[PDB]
Amino acid sequence: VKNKCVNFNFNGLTGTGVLTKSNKKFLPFQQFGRDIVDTTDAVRDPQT
């Protein structure tokens, strides 16, 4: 469910927040996302 605050457990990464589509350029090996503050920003869907 996108565009709705929701607790997520993506591949064992527990948290809460709003998910949506992105136009990122994830390289094939890339799995996670972060920022200069080192906090999980984008998580690739295991099943999509």
Partner: peptide, 24 residues
């Protein structure tokens, strides 16, 4: 056979330490 000449590597041999997308 083979030779063992020495050269310089310059800026080379840098790999993604992990699999976390990062930008800017």
């Amino acid at each position: 056979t083979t030779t063992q000449s020495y050269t310089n590597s310059f800026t080379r041999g840098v790999y993604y330490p992990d699999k976390v997308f990062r930008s800017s």
